Write a protein that binds this ligand. Sequence first.
Ligand SMILES: *[C@@H]1O[C@H](CO[C@@H]2O[C@@H](C)[C@@H](O)[C@@H](O)[C@@H]2O)[C@@H](O[C@@H]2O[C@H](CO)[C@@H](O[C@@H]3O[C@H](CO[C@H]4O[C@H](CO)[C@@H](O)[C@H](O)[C@@H]4O[C@@H]4O[C@H](CO)[C@@H](O)[C@H](O)[C@H]4NC(C)=O)[C@@H](O)[C@H](O[C@H]4O[C@H](CO)[C@@H](O)[C@H](O)[C@@H]4O[C@@H]4O[C@H](CO)[C@@H](O)[C@H](O)[C@H]4NC(C)=O)[C@@H]3O)[C@H](O)[C@H]2NC(C)=O)[C@H](O)[C@H]1NC(C)=O
Ligand SMILES: *[C@@H]1O[C@H](CO[C@@H]2O[C@@H](C)[C@@H](O)[C@@H](O)[C@@H]2O)[C@@H](O[C@@H]2O[C@H](CO)[C@@H](O[C@@H]3O[C@H](CO[C@H]4O[C@H](CO)[C@@H](O)[C@H](O)[C@@H]4O[C@@H]4O[C@H](CO)[C@@H](O)[C@H](O)[C@H]4NC(C)=O)[C@@H](O)[C@H](O[C@H]4O[C@H](CO)[C@@H](O)[C@H](O)[C@@H]4O[C@@H]4O[C@H](CO)[C@@H](O)[C@H](O)[C@H]4NC(C)=O)[C@@H]3O)[C@H](O)[C@H]2NC(C)=O)[C@H](O)[C@H]1NC(C)=O
Ligand SMILES: [Zn+2]
Lengths: 211, 208
Amino acid sequence: LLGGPSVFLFPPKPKDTLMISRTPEVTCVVVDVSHEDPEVKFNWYVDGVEVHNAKTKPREEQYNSTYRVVSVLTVLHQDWLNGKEYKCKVSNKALPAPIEKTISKAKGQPREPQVYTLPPSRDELTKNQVSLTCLVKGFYPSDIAVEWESNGQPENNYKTTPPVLDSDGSFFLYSKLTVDKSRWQQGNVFSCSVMHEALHNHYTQKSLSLS
Amino acid sequence: GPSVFLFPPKPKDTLMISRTPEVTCVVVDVSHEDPEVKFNWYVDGVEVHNAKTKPREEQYNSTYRVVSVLTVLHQDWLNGKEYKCKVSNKALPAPIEKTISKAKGQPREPQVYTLPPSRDELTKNQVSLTCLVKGFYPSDIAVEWESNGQPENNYKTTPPVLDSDGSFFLYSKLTVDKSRWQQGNVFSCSVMHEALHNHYTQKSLSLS
Ligand SMILES: *[C@@H]1O[C@H](CO[C@@H]2O[C@@H](C)[C@@H](O)[C@@H](O)[C@@H]2O)[C@@H](O[C@@H]2O[C@H](CO)[C@@H](O[C@@H]3O[C@H](CO[C@H]4O[C@H](CO)[C@@H](O)[C@H](O)[C@@H]4O[C@@H]4O[C@H](CO)[C@@H](O)[C@H](O)[C@H]4NC(C)=O)[C@@H](O)[C@H](O[C@H]4O[C@H](CO)[C@@H](O)[C@H](O)[C@@H]4O[C@@H]4O[C@H](CO)[C@@H](O)[C@H](O)[C@H]4NC(C)=O)[C@@H]3O)[C@H](O)[C@H]2NC(C)=O)[C@H](O)[C@H]1NC(C)=O
Ligand SMILES: *[C@@H]1O[C@H](CO[C@@H]2O[C@@H](C)[C@@H](O)[C@@H](O)[C@@H]2O)[C@@H](O[C@@H]2O[C@H](CO)[C@@H](O[C@@H]3O[C@H](CO[C@H]4O[C@H](CO)[C@@H](O)[C@H](O)[C@@H]4O[C@@H]4O[C@H](CO)[C@@H](O)[C@H](O)[C@H]4NC(C)=O)[C@@H](O)[C@H](O[C@H]4O[C@H](CO)[C@@H](O)[C@H](O)[C@@H]4O[C@@H]4O[C@H](CO)[C@@H](O)[C@H](O)[C@H]4NC(C)=O)[C@@H]3O)[C@H](O)[C@H]2NC(C)=O)[C@H](O)[C@H]1NC(C)=O
Ligand SMILES: [Zn+2]
């Protein structure tokens, strides 16, 4: 067993913090836990105050002679968005000092996304499929969710870039929805929907159809 | 002990014969006691000798960073040769080897579409000019903006994104004062990619 345990601490998904009916979680994963001595303790802290409601799962033996152990802390939506810091401490007797990782929403003043839908380029109408573009810019923090739909139903064939840092410190991204050109030319309405903390009710939709 | 990371040349540098593409073998966490690192480089398993080791870069965390740089032939890289860097150091029981090469597969020509600012953005002081570059392979690409022969400073480009068909797309956003858009200035999105004729294409964007 040459080596030592490593800790990864994962944030909630952006959609989960923004919808009260969803369940946002912070997840602490410890890997390379000693095969011979796999007992691990977790301590969790929120703004440095210890909390006791995390759910720690049974350790899972890996194929490389190590264990992996996960502890899941359900967070309050408003705690996350109000910038509370979540600390996971992991102790193990084959480890000379506990390992601590901390995570929180990115620091800074939230900024409201501007959302702009862009039709296919005229050069594109040559093709059997066209691209409908959603530009979302000016937003902060980078935690965001983007989706497309038409007639109330989610569209399958879209891809969204990661947030990119802009020159003013805000973020932008684009979402591209691919549709059969026929669907565009018939005047079907498509909608880009954006979920972000700095939108009213955390959500806005911009629509797009043939002019 | 030390850790090795091997980096590919810049997309622009492999596509233009006058530019100098380099593969860079970076060694971190070399101790203060043994900054001595040896480098061997191979191209499809055959030793090459043109690598240059840059002077050791001392770091805040009590280690060195040592970099070896290998100039490559544009066509070797585009033809998919494997570049192997082997690193030997006293703090390493055995040498560490890393290999890098261009992504494998039939290259595919980027389609380049310029999109004007959304009508809703026209209430702003600055507007967004969009260049959609899609259907390309491999993901290595360079994108720049120009107007009246001259580079535009104020743009950001997304990384390549894997599309549903296994090609890549990205978007480039150039921001300009609304006045310049409204005045009929012509802006151009420049794309360099191996699958393009002469490795380069441009598309213009204007109010018109
Ligand atoms: C022995 O085996 C284990 C288990 O592996 C499994 O079994 C073996 C036998 C094989 O069969 C494996 O194929 C098999 O999977 C090995 O365990 C792995 O250990 C490595 C580290 O050595 C871990 O790598 C880290 O991975 C995370 C991302 O992890 C997510 O995504 C994985 C798929 O991409 C997925 O497999 C993971 O489970 C995990 O999934 C996420 O799970 C959360 C919680 O459940 C969930 O909510 C998410 O939705 C889900 N995500 C996805 C995509 O599914 C990665 O983040 C780590 O990167 C950080 O650390 C690096 C340094 O270690 C660094 O280089 C990176 O840049 C990055 O750094 C962080 O970056 C952020 C932002 O930039 C920054 O804020 C942070 O500060 C910074 N972190 C710091 C402080 O360093 C990292 O790459 C694997 O997750 C882990 N696998 C599993 C399954 O647990 C083990 O290595 C083997 N041991 C030996 C000796 O060989
Ligand atoms: C002591 O200090 C030094 C110096 O650190 C610097 O200063 C300190 C004070 C801090 O501020 C640091 O944050 C800061 O970096 C430390 O050295 C660092 O060591 C880490 C690992 O511990 C390295 O991490 C790797 O980074 C590469 C990316 O590296 C580029 O980007 C960085 C900025 O994002 C940049 O700082 C780097 O210099 C480098 O920049 C590039 O340089 C080349 C060459 O010149 C140039 O051509 C490029 O243009 C330039 N790019 C730029 C500017 O962006 C990252 O890719 C590595 O990830 C791989 O490996 C991880 C394992 O550690 C793994 O988790 C990842 O998933 C990923 O895995 C690989 O992925 C590839 C494809 O994705 C895949 O094929 C492989 O399977 C897989 N390989 C595996 C598993 O190994 C990795 O994160 C830092 O680069 C390095 N910093 C510098 C400047 O060298 C040192 O660690 C400190 N030690 C301590 C704490 O004691
Ligand atoms: Zn064992």
